[PDB]
Enzyme design. Structure first.
Site, PDB file in Angstrom:
ATOM      1  N   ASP A   1       1.864   7.747  -1.197  1.00  0.00           N
ATOM      2  CA  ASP A   1       0.579   7.539  -0.530  1.00  0.00           C
ATOM      3  C   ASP A   1       0.294   8.401   0.671  1.00  0.00           C
ATOM      4  O   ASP A   1      -0.863   8.618   0.986  1.00  0.00           O
ATOM      5  CB  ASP A   1       0.451   6.068  -0.126  1.00  0.00           C
TER       6      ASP A   1
ATOM      7  N   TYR B   1      -5.053  -0.767  -3.417  1.00  0.00           N
ATOM      8  CA  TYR B   1      -4.214  -1.537  -2.442  1.00  0.00           C
ATOM      9  C   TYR B   1      -4.845  -1.453  -1.084  1.00  0.00           C
ATOM     10  O   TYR B   1      -5.365  -0.413  -0.722  1.00  0.00           O
ATOM     11  CB  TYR B   1      -2.744  -1.091  -2.180  1.00  0.00           C
TER      12      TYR B   1
END
Ligand SMILES: *[C@@H]1O[C@H](CO)[C@@H](O[C@@H]2O[C@H](CO)[C@@H](O[C@@H]3O[C@H](CO)[C@@H](O)[C@H](O)[C@@H]3O)[C@H](O)[C@H]2NC(C)=O)[C@H](O)[C@H]1NC(C)=O
Ligand SMILES: *[C@@H]1O[C@H](CO)[C@@H](O[C@@H]2O[C@H](CO)[C@@H](O[C@@H]3O[C@H](CO)[C@@H](O)[C@H](O)[C@@H]3O)[C@H](O)[C@H]2NC(C)=O)[C@H](O)[C@H]1NC(C)=O
Ligand SMILES: *[C@@H]1O[C@H](CO[C@H]2O[C@@H](C)[C@@H](O)[C@@H](O)[C@@H]2O)[C@@H](O[C@@H]2O[C@H](CO)[C@@H](O)[C@H](O)[C@H]2NC(C)=O)[C@H](O)[C@H]1NC(C)=O
Ligand SMILES: *[C@@H]1O[C@H](CO)[C@@H](O[C@@H]2O[C@H](CO)[C@@H](O)[C@H](O)[C@H]2NC(C)=O)[C@H](O)[C@H]1NC(C)=O
Ligand SMILES: *[C@H]1O[C@H](CO[C@H]2O[C@@H](C)[C@@H](O)[C@@H](O)[C@@H]2O)[C@@H](O)[C@H](O)[C@H]1NC(C)=O
Ligand SMILES: *[C@@H]1O[C@H](CO)[C@@H](O)[C@H](O)[C@H]1NC(C)=O
Ligand SMILES: [Ca+2]
Ligand SMILES: [Ca+2]
Ligand SMILES: [Ca+2]
Ligand SMILES: [Ca+2]
Ligand SMILES: [Cu+2]
Ligand SMILES: [Cu+2]
EC number: 1.4.3.21
Lengths: 705, 705
Positions: free
Chosen positions: A332, A417
């Site tokens: 990420d 998320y």
């Protein structure tokens, strides 16, 4: 009636950002383009953000009183308009009015940064969608009209990494209904496309493969043909519906208000810029664009515990029935935990009466922007005693202290998320770092249980693991530290006063960890029950002054080393590692690993290299994570309950006694005293103290993009 | 502007009613426990006898009549040639008519008299011996070291001997400090008192320990002091700091945060029964076993029949005999019996609902612990769930987490145990326990470092482990349940679209646990990452309806089986165990184990016996604990920070979707909508809603003994 109320690590300001961008445009040659509408062969500026100072200088300033080190900035520039295009890393300073600019790429990475490692630009995503929606999907409109209400009403979502091999830039994209006001992620239409977008000229971009409802096809042509031939049995995925699959708006109207917290005699902390100060705690906070939340120069009652605690990387490894799911490994940081910080909604994300704070950045654009309410800072009454004793034995007394913590929080929403980054400061001298995953799960079209659970009509909730890495640069009572492991053991023994009998004698085992390799704990290995970093110097009672790492983690099994990809996030393999701190080893990851993990730009395992950790400036590297098998209760969103993961940093003979003994808020009274006597017991004056309505600010929200 | 009781503990009346009946039917001869001597006959305890499940359920669901409300009495029968402890069931309340000796039914034989708990009067008698008969024999020494002239106190240990039948107890001696813990002021002297004889006159002192050395009697110690071989180390009488006090030297600053319910509370307590929007349950305390909850219902549906604390255990190591042989099986004293009052605004939030407990233990009239329980809603200051969408559709949807808590605290000697049961809005239940209060200490001599850390002048903070056992009788979607283990694995594979390449294919492994022994996880064993109990029936998406046990535990190494003592708390060896639920297996421990663990009255390991757990009424047994090596920061008290240990019970495909979707408090709004518009967003109306001063009750405290 009525009711009261050294920035050397601060993130760069609007001005400072502008100042560096000006200086760049000047010194960088025209042909420079706004990153936000650049193309692969353009030159542009991808990112401008704070370059952190060297420690020796930073400390000299903070302690010895010497002058500050040059305040600098780091810029990532894509150099496309070039025979051999590269990404380059450029240090620009000194702020507030920069004069120089140095290319550190070759210094840092020992050679040029391959162009294919660059993150996919926002424009690049748009170009890819032009291809898909204009050139490609129409070729299969026969099928699409039958299954998917084609007529625009579909959206794509990226995956990563982008290929099978260093150099590749082919990305699988899933297709979903563009649901309105709710997560699309739960509405995969069953179609994924392998887009090869390596070519500098988007015209040359092609589609290598097509996956549809359980089968691979070579083109949308085939897939359409085969659909027309009548060997593709389309199962109809609906466009619309009701419930959590389709909505976040509750069908149930508000009842009575939930509990609300307030500060009856004003707040007990301040935020000035990047700096927080309270009775007990002092630290500077901020966000790396890519690396995410971080804290510095943390001081308990005036004394430094930690130089730096920063999020380093986050990782989500997936499994699935389809190509997207089964190969996705998000690193990420290659997108950016800071870059994707979202605003904190007052009274949901943090308590209504928190102090909210804005973040300024310059990423993929020319002018700096702001995320409003990027951070929140607040004191929380935990509703739970820090400490307590009730004595009915011999002497009748009570002594306790309710626990109130100081929190700092940001949230990153990367695609589906929402990551939640807590740093909680305890009145005991303890620091706690937590992280929760919430938000939407990622789903796939359903066509035998090896890869997750069915969570709604036609939807597979794909199994995956979360994990996160933290740099923890403790400087326990100075720089020079040692690493200690303590545990327990039982030893059979004759009972001294009756040797005909046997007792099991509980004992403490203690070992000093001398070399780096002894402090590197792989996932699945046994771990010392007490592990701590300590100073040479001792407390009043002759024990080395220590702080201890204690881990709250349910860590998933890591991606096998047998995988070539693994070296791109080799930190995943450790629970904890302590290494010598070094200027040339500032981070465990790199924004350039996401797109080329096979040829990682930073490889964490390299840091662990068979040196002494006996009396050096040490730094601990903590991994935390868990495995998630989605289930019905993840719809609409995954709850935070029980999914928090992280670690504590607790004092272990650092002090001569519990700091909270001398808390201004500790309650104490004897059984013969008067517990209602305000002068005896402060809690008795609370109903006076709190006989006032709180002055709540008007609700504001920090908006969208 | 201001702002079925079929599981209830027995009431004052019911207790009196039973005592009356017992007085009558137990013949004369019957003494009051507080006065009783070993050879007396007395009633030790009267408390609720829990009903059989089938009958309880018949009533609760099928609507049949209630089962007989009964009570259980423990009676010491000393005035007898062969004295025994007997267990007597008395009913039916409110006005009992029968009384049945269940001892031989339940334990298959009489209860040896030596297993009986040491009475309060017995402790007093023991002190008479020590202080009148014994210590004066060493007053020469005591004058020199200890300000003898009464100013000293004893503390028990357990178990009491080396072998089934024994009743010899080591007692340490401490300065009777005033208004602060004595536990930190061991004078260096321990005495092995043999109090087995029914006639206290015959009680003797088998051994003496003083400042590192063993003596046969106090005669010896004094003879040897006066002979010039015992070198006293003067331990001070008095001082300042946390070693000596709990009163802070720092005056109150501004008030800490305070929580309140701006539109009234959102739950009710009627008797033993709690009710809220989402949750419904009955609560209470076993005198010995401690806190428990029953008939827990989420939105009307039963999740758990029973969750109850079963036992607590503290195993010690040390330089001295008390420390090195102490193994407290705290139920042998009583977690309910030693519940202390909750101090408003320290132990629970000020505005919690406090509730009294009534009991009848070691006396003739029932008494009350005021504010034994507290019940409250806590805003956790943290989202249950959240998503911020800047991508494709601009919306926000979240819900702040507010939990419902139930809490008691047990103060056993030095420790104060905190017992939380937290009910989450997601359908999850969380059971936690924290240890706080005073550590137990010993006089410091010798150079090993093997048995703990020095925590103050002359004080060894003795190493030990805590652990606790819980009975969890889930009835997931009915009685018949199965046990499932799920985990992850990686499987090498050719890349489908490029077989020259290898990918690591993440997959879910799943196994049904068929036999009891397969669900019995020893401490130190690997444990499935997902373990759940489920029904036969499925949710909407075809998965069995499950609830999952997730463990927060740092468990210490258990006492070796090689130890004869171990069978008295064999549950310590397991992390988790699922067994068939059975009326004749109601508890994992017994109040009679503490004093005879060598011949345990209940032996948990016997429950795990090679039967099916495939489709029965199942019951999980969870162990949680940790190792504690004391350190400076445990002085004055051990803090709760990071020492909470326990487990979650989370829904796993039990529902069709997250039940918080339909929360009355979820917030949602699109980017095009008005977030300040109260009709759009309830948080906007909060400053109106909460524009009122809270009506705080006058501070009361529940007093002492
Ligand atoms: C990666 O790409 C960047 C962008 O092209 C390269 O930067 C440029 O490198 C050359 C040095 O080789 C510089 O320009 C030269 O200037 C000297 C006189 O100053 C002259 O001899 C030549 O006629 C030439 O113009 C310049 O420093 C630099 N340009 C910019 C705008 O920064 C970089 O070197 C590449 N590096 C690697 C390792 O790939
Ligand atoms: C443990 O101790 C108690 C001591 O009382 C024993 O209970 C008593 O048992 C006797 C039998 O020896 C019972 O007496 C019976 O009742 C009538 C009374 O009129 C008597 O005349 C009969 O001949 C008969 O013996 C007595 O009721 C009973 N008391 C109680 C409260 O149970 C008990 O037997 C002992 N248990 C064991 C397992 O040793
Ligand atoms: C803690 O150590 C300090 C610092 O230690 C250096 O001395 C080397 C022998 C080695 O231990 C190295 O790892 C360590 O960093 C001690 O003070 C030093 O003490 C020496 C005496 O040997 C002096 O001559 C030095 O001036 C001094 N050096 C520095 C850099 O401070 C100190 O004695 C010790 N204290 C305790 C309680 O252990
Ligand atoms: C031990 O010391 C305690 C602490 O001083 C004594 O407690 C006091 O006792 C007197 C006499 O009953 C009371 O009037 C005081 O109010 C008590 N103080 C507290 C704080 O409870 C206790 O009496 C002593 N116990 C002994 C000598 O065994
Ligand atoms: C699940 O089982 C119920 C009856 O249980 C017994 O039936 C036998 C086949 C054997 O497996 C026993 O061990 C079972 O306990 C039955 O009445 C339920 O309706 C069943 N339902 C489903 C959907 O499986
Ligand atoms: C989502 O919906 C609208 C159509 O009403 C469209 O303009 C928007 O961009 C859609 N998403 C796309 C086009 O990617
Ligand atoms: Ca350091
Ligand atoms: Ca290194
Ligand atoms: Ca059950
Ligand atoms: Ca069994
Ligand atoms: Cu997840
Ligand atoms: Cu402890």
């Amino acid at each position: 009636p009525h009711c009261p109320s050294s920035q050397l690590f601060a993130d760069l300001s609007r001005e400072e950002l502008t100042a560096v961008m000006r200086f760049l445009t000047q010194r960088l040659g025209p042909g420079l383009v706004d990153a936000a509408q650049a193309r692969p062969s353009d030159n542009c500026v991808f990112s401008v953000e704070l370059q952190l100072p060297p420690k020796a200088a930073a400390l000299a300033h903070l302690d010895r009183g010497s002058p500050p080190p040059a305040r600098e900035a780091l810029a990532i520039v894509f150099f496309g308009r070039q025979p051999q295009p590269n990404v380059s890393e450029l240090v620009v300073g000194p702020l507030p009015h920069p004069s120089y600019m140095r290319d550190v790429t070759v210094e840092r990475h020992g050679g040029p940064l391959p162009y294919h490692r660059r993150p996919v630009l926002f424009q690049e995503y748009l170009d890819i969608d032009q291809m898909i929606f204009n050139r490609e999907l129409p070729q299969a409109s026969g099928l699409l009209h039958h299954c998917c209400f084609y007529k625009r009403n579909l959206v794509t979502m990226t995956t990563a990494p982008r290929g099978l091999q260093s150099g590749d830039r082919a990305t699988w994209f899933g297709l979903y209904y563009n649901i309105s006001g709710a997560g699309f992620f739960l509405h995969h239409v069953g179609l994924e496309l392998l887009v090869n977008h390596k070519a500098l000229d988007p015209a040359r971009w092609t589609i290598q493969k097509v996956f549809y409802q359980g089968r691979y096809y070579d083109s949308l042509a085939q897939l359409e043909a085969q659909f027309e031939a009548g060997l593709v049995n389309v199962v109809l995925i609906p466009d619309n519906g009701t419930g959590g699959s389709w909505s976040l708006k509750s069908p149930v109207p508000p009842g009575p208000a939930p509990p609300l917290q307030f500060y009856p005699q004003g707040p007990r902390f301040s935020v000035q810029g990047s700096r927080v100060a309270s009775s007990l705690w002092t630290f500077s906070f901020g966000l790396g664009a890519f690396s995410g939340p971080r804290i510095f120069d943390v001081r308990f009652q005036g004394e430094r515990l930690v130089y730096e605690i920063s999020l380093q990387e986050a990782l989500a490894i997936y499994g699935g029935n389809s190509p997207a799911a089964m190969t996705t490994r998000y690193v990420d940081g290659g997108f950016g935990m800071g870059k994707y910080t979202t605003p904190l909604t007052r009274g949901v994300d943090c308590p209504y009466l928190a102090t909210y704070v804005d973040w300024h950045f310059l990423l993929e654009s020319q002018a700096p922007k702001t995320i409003r309410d990027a951070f929140c800072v607040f004191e929380q009454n935990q509703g739970l005693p820090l400490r307590r004793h009730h004595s009915d034995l011999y002497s009748h007394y009570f002594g306790g202290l309710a626990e109130t913590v100081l929190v700092v929080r940001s949230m990153s929403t990367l695609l589906n998320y929402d990551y939640v980054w807590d740093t909680v400061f305890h009145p005991s001298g303890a620091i706690e770092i937590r992280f929760y995953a919430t938000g939407y799960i990622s789903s796939a079209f359903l066509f035998t249980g090896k890869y997750g659970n069915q969570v709604s009509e036609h939807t597979l909730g794909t199994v995956h693991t979360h994990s996160a890495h933290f740099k923890v640069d403790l400087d326990v009572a100075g720089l020079e530290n040692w690493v200690w492991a303590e545990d327990m053991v039982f030893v059979p023994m004759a009972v001294p006063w009756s040797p005909e009998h046997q007792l099991q004698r509980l004992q403490v085992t203690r070992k000093l960890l001398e070399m780096e390799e002894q402090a590197a704990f792989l996932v699945g290995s046994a771990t010392p029950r007490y592990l701590y970093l300590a100073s040479n110097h001792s407390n009043k009672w002759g024990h080395p002054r220590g702080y201890r790492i204690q881990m709250l983690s349910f860590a998933g099994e890591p991606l096998p080393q047998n995988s070539s990809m693994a070296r791109g996030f080799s930190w995943e393999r450790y629970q904890l590692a302590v290494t010598q701190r070094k200027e040339e080893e500032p981070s465990s990851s790199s924004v350039f690993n996401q797109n080329d993990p096979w040829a990682p730009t930073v490889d964490f395992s390299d840091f662990i290299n068979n040196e002494t950790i006996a009396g050096k400036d040490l730094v601990a590297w903590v991994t935390a994570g868990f495995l998630h098998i989605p289930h019905a209760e993840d719809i609409p969103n995954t709850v935070t309950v029980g999914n928090g993961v992280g670690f504590f940093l607790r004092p272990y003979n650092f002090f001569d006694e519990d700091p909270s003994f001398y808390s201004a808020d500790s309650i104490y009274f004897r059984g013969d005293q008067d517990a209602g006597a305000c002068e005896v017991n402060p809690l008795a004056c609370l109903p006076q103290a709190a006989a006032c309505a709180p002055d709540l600010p008007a609700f504001s929200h920090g908006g969208f993009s």
